[PDB]
Amino acid sequence: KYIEYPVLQKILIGLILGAIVGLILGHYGYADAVKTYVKPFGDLFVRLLKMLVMPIVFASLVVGAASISPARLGRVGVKIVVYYLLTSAFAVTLGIIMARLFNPGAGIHPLVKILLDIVPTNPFGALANGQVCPTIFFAIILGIAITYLMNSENEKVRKSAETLLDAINGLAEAMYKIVNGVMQYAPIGVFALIAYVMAEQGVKVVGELAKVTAAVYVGLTLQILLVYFVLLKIYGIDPISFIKKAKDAMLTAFVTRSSSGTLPVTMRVAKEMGISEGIYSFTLPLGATINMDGTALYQGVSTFFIANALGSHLTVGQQLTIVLTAVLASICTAGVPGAGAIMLAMVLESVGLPLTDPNVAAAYAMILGIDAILDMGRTMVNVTGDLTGTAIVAKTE
Numbered sequence: 001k002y003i004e005y006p007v008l009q010k011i012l013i014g015l016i017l018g019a020i021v022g023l024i025l026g027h028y029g030y031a032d033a034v035k036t037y038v039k040p041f042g043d044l045f046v047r048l049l050k051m052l053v054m055p056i057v058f059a060s061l062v063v064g065a066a067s068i069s070p071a072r073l074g075r076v077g078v079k080i081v082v083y084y085l086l087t088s089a090f091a092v093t094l095g096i097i098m099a100r101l102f103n104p105g106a107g108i109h110p111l112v113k114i115l116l117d118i119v120p121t122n123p124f125g126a127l128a129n130g131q132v133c134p135t136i137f138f139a140i141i142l143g144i145a146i147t148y149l150m151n152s153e154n155e156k157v158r159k160s161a162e163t164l165l166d167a168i169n170g171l172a173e174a175m176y177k178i179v180n181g182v183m184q185y186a187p188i189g190v191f192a193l194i195a196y197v198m199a200e201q202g203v204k205v206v207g208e209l210a211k212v213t214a215a216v217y218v219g220l221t222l223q224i225l226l227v228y229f230v231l232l233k234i235y236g237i238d239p240i241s242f243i244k245k246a247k248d249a250m251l252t253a254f255v256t257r258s259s260s261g262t263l264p265v266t267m268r269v270a271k272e273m274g275i276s277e278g279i280y281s282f283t284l285p286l287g288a289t290i291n292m293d294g295t296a297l298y299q300g301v302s303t304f305f306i307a308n309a310l311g312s313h314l315t316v317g318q319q320l321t322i323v324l325t326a327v328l329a330s331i332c333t334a335g336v337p338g339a340g341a342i343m344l345a346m347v348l349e350s351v352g353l354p355l356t357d358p359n360v361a362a363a364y365a366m367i368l369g370i371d372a373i374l375d376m377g378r379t380m381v382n383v384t385g386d387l388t389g390t391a392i393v394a395k396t397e
């Protein structure tokens with residue numbers, strides 16, 4: 001048809017128009033019809049994404065782990081899991097600082113059981129009900145086992161396995177195309193989502209919110225410059241060269257608010273910049289759900305906002321408790337637009353800011369509005385975290 005442009009341009013066109021349109025209408029009469037007519041064209045987008053998160057989690061790992069020999073998995077597995085966890089802890093620390101510096105939120109005044117649940121009691125039940133991390137466990141296990149079999153002596157299993165491995169790898173690829181298909185519908189959805197927001201904007205409505213948005217976006221820029229450039233220069237990468245390519249990937253997530261749908265793009269980029277097949281196949285899909293630096297930061301800052309409004313001044317011991325709980329939530333969260341705030345309640349109940357009080361939900365409701373904006377920045381940082389950790393490893397290897 002007439003829609004044959006490259007994808008990214010259509011999305012940038014749709015986003016601009018949605019911002020302008022939403023405002024001019026906000027003033028004038030028809031500001032509450034968008035909620036009635038437009039919004040579905042946004043909800044209909046979200047649901048398409050959640051659909052395709054799981055299948056590409058399960059499959060891509062199985063295919064990724066089986067190809068790599070067991071030995072090489074140890075090196076690239078240990079190295080990465082290290083890089084993913086630490087940086088996620090550094091970031092949340094970097095956010096706490098920024099909250100004390102800006103000081104938002106004036107207003108008016110089992111730990112083992114979780115680390116144990118990552119083993120599924122029944123796999124097909126977790127695969128369905130929604131549990132994310134357990135499927136990462138069973139996926140890896142099944143990828144390693146298929147490896148030993150293909151070397152087995154009896155010619156029946158050596159055939160059986162391959163067919164199994166050929167099926168799944170067939171499943172994934174199907175999902176990579178579905179993604180490309182959705183994106184064509186994205187620009188409409190993008191236009192709607194932002195529009196409904198501007199009709200009910202929160203930016204600069206009050207000094208509190210304004211500070212929040214600045215406290216975050218500053219931390220996210222300090223996160224990139226301070227941490228990533230440091231590391232890249234140490235190992236011997238030219239950053240601006242690295243960022244240059246990444247701009248195609250970063251832009252797509254910024255507007256779209258998804259770490260998964262961008263996945264095929266990211267893997268397209270990595271080849272242009274010359275990384276090896278086996279390493280990026282494994283680390284990218286793993287990194288999407290596990291490595292969420294930016295989500296952590298937002299979860300630390302918001303927690304301090306809620307606490308500062310209540311006046312629940314935080315001793316050191318619980319500040320570490322925030323750090324540790326924020327890391328876990330960034331992992332369990334799924335990687336689609338709304339998941340980031342849902343778990344923010346987890347950390348809150350962990351420290352003891354219970355949702356039973358109406359005041360907290362009022363404070364919570366405030367963050368939830370602006371959350372629409374913050375979602376665009378959060379995703380940009382996360383995707384770069386994956387490309388960075390990948391390039392590092394491919395260097396030493």
Ligand SMILES: N[C@@H](CC(=O)O)C(=O)O
Nearest residue numbers: 258259335336337340378
């Ligand atoms: N779920 C988003 C991030 C967020 O919503 O905060 C992503 O990983 O792409």
